[PDB]
Design a binder for these strands. Structure first.
Ligand code: ZN
Ligand code: ZN
Ligand code: ZN
Ligand code: ZN
Lengths: 99, 93
DNA sequence: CACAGGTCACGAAGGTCA
DNA sequence: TGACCTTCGTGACCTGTG
């Protein structure tokens, strides 16, 4: 029950790995942009709940090493059916709830 | 007695195929909702009790491939007429 | 018993805004 | 960034019928 990346209090599985709420958003936001990060120090930052915001290159690496699948991030094209086909069941759940 | 879709313990046939309770519910919802899934991998995932939740595309395709039949799911009109023969056979006993 | 559907607590996507 | 929130799909278990 602990975040595999930073050792923070994990909230459950996210993109197939047990991460905290912050490494969840960081992974999704990072991958969604395809951001390439480069490390300012060596390239083996010992990531923690505190300094986790300082080395992205390494945080995103510990991310992937831990098992997070960028495939599990919904494709913009998919965030679409969901966003819209929301009001599609809401339009039909309204129609049956009329007659 | 094994789910022909994910390997999990099965509870009997469901829509014509030996399946677990998760895949029966998955199959019925996916079919009723006319859902269109698309695999984020190579389209040949290996469904297993512990990852079936990750590829709906392949799970549903596996459902159909082992033989689950959408024609066994009751249509809403059949459901409605049912919970009427349940409300009739109720207010009659 | 076998098997349709029904229930609802619970997991994990995205969104939001300080 | 990330804490907290809204949504909807899941499946263990249950009811009702044939
Ligand atoms: Zn973390
Ligand atoms: Zn680093
Ligand atoms: Zn199954
Ligand atoms: Zn797949």
């Amino acid at each position: 029950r602990i975040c595999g990346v930073c050792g923070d209090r994990a909230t459950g599985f996210h993109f197939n790995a047990m991460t905290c709420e912050g490494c969840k958003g960081f992974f999704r936001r990072s991958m969604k942009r395809k951001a390439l990060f480069t490390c300012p120090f060596n390239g083996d930052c010992r990531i923690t709940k505190d300094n986790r915001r300082h080395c992205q290159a390494c945080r995103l690496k510990r991310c992937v090493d831990i098992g997070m699948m960028k495939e599990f991030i919904l494709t913009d094209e998919e965030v679409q059916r969901k966003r819209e086909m929301i009001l599609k069941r809401k339009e039909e759940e309204a129609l049956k709830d009329s007659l």
